[PDB]
Amino acid sequence: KAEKQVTLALQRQRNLHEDKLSVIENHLGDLEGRVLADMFDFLSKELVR
Amino acid sequence: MQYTGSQYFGEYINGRMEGSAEYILPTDTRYIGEMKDGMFHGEGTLFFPSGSRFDAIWKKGLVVKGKYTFNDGLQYEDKHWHYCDSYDRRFYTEICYGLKPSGISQLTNMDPPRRIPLGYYDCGDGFYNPTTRVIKDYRNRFLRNADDDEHEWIVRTCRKGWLPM
């Protein structure tokens, strides 16, 4: 009965934390993508022109 | 823009260009153009570094057009071209005017009348001597040099700066 809540708590603490941090990290991946992308597409299209 | 020199005057969406616009290309060519998806998507005219006009219609970012006109405004054909040839050996101004309005010796490609200065030739851009294999530009500086094939073409075809007989 003790170990049950020990495991449940440890699991849910881990899983929630993982979700939260990955969620935050995503936005940064978005903004880095945006900045890479707009140049990459512009200058490649430009060359072929 | 900067990294090749391209230039544009028009509207931007998502940061990439979508426009009806005048435009400049790091040829220092000028253009007037419409855009989509950050690409040309237009019927547009390209104004040369030498001013003359090429035209470009754009399909999905590729070109499909034929028109040209010179910087003087001579209308041109890239094929069959009927100009100063078997139907009449008259230049653009001589066909438009007929006899040039006062008959100045520019009943010829360039005048008022002179000998070609250095020697050399006329081939319109440049002076070239078959005795020197050098072409020169009308500021009497220089132009691309030429061995036997082009030399022989100049020798037969065009007008030397021989002495005026």
Swiss-Prot record, chain A:
Entry comment on modification after translation: Phosphorylated by PKA.
Coiled coil: none
Cellular localization per UniProt: Cytoplasm; Mitochondrion; Cytoplasm, Cytoskeleton, Cilium axoneme
Highest taxon of source: Eukaryota
Tissues in which the UniProt entry reports expression: Expressed in the testis, in cells involved in spermatogenesis.
Family per record: Belongs to the CFAP91 family.
Oligomer status and interactors: Part of a complex containing MYCBP, AKAP1 and PRKAR2B. Interacts with MYCBP and AKAP1. Interacts with CFAP61.
Purpose of the protein: Involved in sperm flagellum axonemal organization and function. May regulate cilium motility through its role in the assembly of the axonemal radial spokes.
Name this protein carries in UniProt: Cilia- and flagella-associated protein 91
Shown segment, full-protein numbering: 540 to 588 of 783
Swiss-Prot record, chain B:
SUPFAM superfamilies reported in the protein's UniProt record: Histone H3 K4-specific methyltransferase SET7/9 N-terminal domain
Assigned keywords, A-Z: Cell projection, Cilium, Flagellum, Repeat
SMART domains reported in the protein's UniProt record: MORN (SM00698)
Record organism: Mus musculus
MORN repeats: 8-30, 31-53, 54-75
Location of the protein in the cell: Cell projection, Cilium, Flagellum
PANTHER family: MORN REPEAT-CONTAINING PROTEIN 5
The protein, known as: MORN repeat-containing protein 5
This protein's GO CC annotations: sperm flagellum
Free-text tissue specificity from the UniProt record: Only detected in testis (at protein level).
